Amino acid sequence: QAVVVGVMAGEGVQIGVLLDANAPVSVMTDPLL
Amino acid sequence: PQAVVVGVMAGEGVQIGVLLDANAPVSVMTDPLL
């Protein structure tokens, strides 16, 4: 299971990323950054 | 300077305070705001 979302970044630049469905945000916010 | 706080008016009269992204274009925010 997974999900894809539009992550907004610097000056509002739109970026697309794929994230796990069940893992908590705390374990993914580091590699995502 | 990355964000600004504003009060948004919604249906029939409820006012809600929100902190918006100061540089993304408004059209990108209207959907999640609703």
Any CB–CB contact under 8 A between B25 and chain A?
A: yes
Judge contact between B21 and B3, C-beta under 8 A: yes
Q: What are phi and psi of B3, to 5 degrees?
A: -150, 160
Bridge partners of B28?
none
Q: Give which of B4, B19, B23, B33 to mutate to test A binding, by max A Cβ within 10 Å.
A: B23
Query: A11: helix, coil or strand?
Result: helix
Residue type, A30: D
Distances (CA, A) of A33 to A2, A11, B11: 18, 16, 37
- Return the number of CB contacts < 8 Å for A and B: 10
- Taking an 8 Å cut-off on Cβ atoms, the answer to whether B25 and A11 are in contact is no
The answer, for B7 touching chain A at a CB cutoff of 8 Å, is: no
Q: How long, in residues, is chain B?
A: 34
Q: How was this structure determined?
A: cryo-EM
The angstrom resolution of this structure is 6.7
Residue B7: C-alpha distances to residues A25, B15, B20 (Å):
28, 6, 10
